[PDB]
Subunit: 107 residues, 2 copies
């Protein structure tokens, strides 16, 4: 699963519903906090629609639990990330990921 | 595309053919040499079917020019990897990758 740990509160009432487009600022890391990719380095918010499996399960499900303006740390288990085979070349097998995500807005 | 630079020679005759299974030991890293994943960390060779697009275009197209027993440094441009979009959370946009690949055998 995905363990969500709030860093900054959102509005607590505007949560992502299926079909909407999530505008976020993320930072994907390895279990120990090793930075891999951050949309903050490009100053461009990343968009993804709920129900389209555009991102990994824990990435999306962790966000569905957040309200607009919130920023939290999402600890994703391998089964919710890239599983037992991982993504050969970039992601090793059985990898737990830690994302720092901020739900900028919905659309 | 991909640039093949031989670190160690192969037999120079046994080249991969569509359908065969390529057995390799790799180490994928970014353009500056930062390591991401290595099958050697698990002492388990990696396998992929030639022509089945089971890996990024540069990964596969480099091994197709390698003979059994050869170990080479493959410099893969962004277009032959994850492109302008990359792979959000793992690899950033316009990323040149560098793989150290060893063609252990064909099967």
């Amino acid at each position: 699963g995905v363990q969500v740990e709030t860093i900054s509160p959102g509005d607590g009432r505007t949560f992502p519903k299926r079909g909407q487009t999530c505008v976020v600022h993320y930072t994907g890391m390895l279990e120990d906090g090793k930075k891999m990719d951050s949309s903050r380095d490009r100053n461009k918010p990343f968009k993804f629609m709920l129900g389209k499996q555009e991102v990994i399960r824990g990435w999306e499900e962790g966000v569905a639990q957040m309200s607009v303006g919130q920023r939290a740390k999402l600890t994703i288990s391998p089964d919710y990330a890239y599983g037992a085979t991982g993504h050969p070349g970039i992601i090793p097998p059985h990898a737990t990921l830690v994302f720092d995500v901020e739900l900028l807005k919905l659309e």
